[model samples]
Target: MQIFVKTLTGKTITLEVEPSDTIENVKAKIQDKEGIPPDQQRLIFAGKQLEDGRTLSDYNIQKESTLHLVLRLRGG
Candidate 1:
């Protein structure tokens, strides 16, 4: 299955994953592609938080699904 990932920075990436892949796995992949840390990654789909323990299947995600991952910005 192919999934589309978009970052808050306006960078977009597409990845191929197995049907059994979890959201955590996709997050790791996005982190690798965007050079972001896990702690800073926040994925949202349809305006809801994509929790860590859920798989894509759990969320009823299908092929060509697009997920938005935002890297929180912090400043002192």
Candidate 2:
């Protein structure tokens, strides 16, 4: 299915995904393709947090679904 990753800046990225893909896998793709590393990616769908080891199918994510992205902030 195709998923849209929407960022805080209102920009959206289109990603082709499979049910077998884990949430971590998705983050890694975004890191490679979008330049946001997995450690800084916080993906939320349907108001639920996406866990790293969980598969997309486990979250019941469907075609055309939009996952909101919030960047992880770090402070020293």
Highest TM-score: give the candidate number: 2
| lDDT by residue for model 1 (11-35), tens | 7677888767887888778777767
Please state the error at residue 4 of candidate 1 in Å: 0.9
What is each predicted model's overall lDDT from 0 to 1? 0.67, 0.69
Query: Candidate 1 clash total?
Result: 0
Question: For candidate 2, lDDT tens digit of each residue in 1-74?
Answer: 76677766667778888878998888888788778666555676765677879898776545355444444423
> Which residue window of length 10 is worst by lDDT in model 1?
67-76
TM-scores for all predictions: 0.71, 0.73
Give candidate 1 regions above 4 Å deviation.
Answer: 61-76
Deviation in angstroms for 61 in model 1? 5.7
